Amino acid sequence: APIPTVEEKWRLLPAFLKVKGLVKQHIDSFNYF
Amino acid sequence: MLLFCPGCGNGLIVEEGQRCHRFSCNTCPYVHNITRKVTNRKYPKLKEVDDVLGGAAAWENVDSTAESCPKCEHPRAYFMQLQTRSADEPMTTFYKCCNAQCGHRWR
Amino acid sequence: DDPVVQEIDVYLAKSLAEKLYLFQYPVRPASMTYDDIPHLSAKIKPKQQKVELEMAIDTLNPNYCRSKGEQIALNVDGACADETSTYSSKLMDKQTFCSSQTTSNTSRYAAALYRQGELHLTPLHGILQLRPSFSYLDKADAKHREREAEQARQRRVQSYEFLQKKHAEEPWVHLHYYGLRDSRSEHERQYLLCPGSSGVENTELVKSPSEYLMMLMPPSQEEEKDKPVAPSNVLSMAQLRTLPLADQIKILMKNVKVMPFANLMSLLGPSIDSVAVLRGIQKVAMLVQGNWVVKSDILYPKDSSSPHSGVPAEVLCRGRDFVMWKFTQSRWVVRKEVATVTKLCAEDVKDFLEHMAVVRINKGWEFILPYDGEFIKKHPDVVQRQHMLWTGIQAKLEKV
Amino acid sequence: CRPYIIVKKQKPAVTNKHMEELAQGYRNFEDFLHESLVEYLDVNEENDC
Amino acid sequence: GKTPAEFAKLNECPLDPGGYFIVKGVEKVILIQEQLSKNRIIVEADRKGA
């Protein structure tokens, strides 16, 4: 039987990109220091 | 196998100074007198015996039965086999064949 | 899995709370019991607890090699001085051990005595490890060697001989030994059993499993250096206790613009009063077509300005007030050219309607969610209170 | 580290309802973390699963 | 924390990534550095095979 699909999975990515992700490493490290 | 002294916990040594050999310590007078025989060694070490009898050596080891090749089956290679390393590991077999201008030696 | 058998009880004996020690010999097998050989002498110190033990050894039996014993004696003790010889005879009369500490605190360790139908515990006062003492070679070395022949910042706290001196301050105490063969041992062993009724309800251990979980696991931070003002996105799903229910409501409304009433109770939970929340809802959200919608000023405070990537301008909440007035007047809005009356730039129109509505091909914009039965809930008064509040707002709004 | 969705007994932890909630805006990424729906794996730890 | 409207008065681009320094009026970036762990038992064979 075909397992049910969660079509919207990919929407977890934009939220992650909002709170963390690209070019946030330098900002977070400098803030912490 | 190794031994340590019950009294002091260091390694024993073997020596003779009286009618009978003795297992003794080097720091305390504890000793045991060996009256019997123990049967386990440290597996000593001497290197590869290859050319003990290299080349067309004596003919006492001749034997009757032999195998044959799958391709050509010419009349000259009688059997031989050999060993790997030590007293507690297997022994191997190789079928090497050699007339000219090739490279054969089957495992 | 029901309890099957041997549902035995447990008991605590305080008779020996400070009197109990556990002694372990790493260097000797468990089968090689020490009980047989006669013990001779021992020493103890109460603080920085350590002990020394002196042990008889047979010299006549064959396994003692007498000659080497005599050589060791001559090497370790004076030839004929013998005033303070380590041995009374000219051979090894005895051998000694040294103790070692294992841990500072031992609270979480308890000895136990099992018995048919009962089991008795006892707190341990300390654990120590014993090892054979090799100081006698050092004594022999010393005897051979004697036969041969504005102060800077203190650092003595870290030097070993300071600890030796600290430990030397403590006087020695000696103790009379009694072996397992002595009936005195069974006499002492009587004290482990504690008397009392077999069935008693313990007064202590009152804490419930709930209390025990955070008891053994205290909060990581005893006090946080900052307060959860929650201006930005936070943990909306967990109803923060420190956040007042009116502030919670304001945060949900800030986070998300339009929902039916039933969601409020779905998210706040049945524990929250369904009536009291009306006061906050009326303070912060108005119902349109039966569905509550947030205020414009909450989303665009008068201090703020046009944030979007279009044209900067004063914070015209009235533009939002226009689109919601239209949506109260009609189910859907086909008026593509609101900018003619609002006079605002186009991106404002798409931005406001993106908040409020959904695009329909060749039919402008329509309500994002269906009509709801606003009279199912028994509040006709607030429905009317919205009706003439918006009538007055519209009358004021007509001016532009 | 990387985030992954957690699977138990062959059914994912996350379900369309959650994605609907997230899209509408009830909750946010960090919410999925407390509720044990996603977790951060690390190179030494993703060697095990 | 500024909005797009306010950036323009500052002569800055909204889409700019940020995360870099300005020293003597030139844009400097500190690159991420990679190195092996500390405090581990590494087992290895010498150049002679030992």
Ligand SMILES: [Zn+2]
């Ligand atoms: Zn010894």
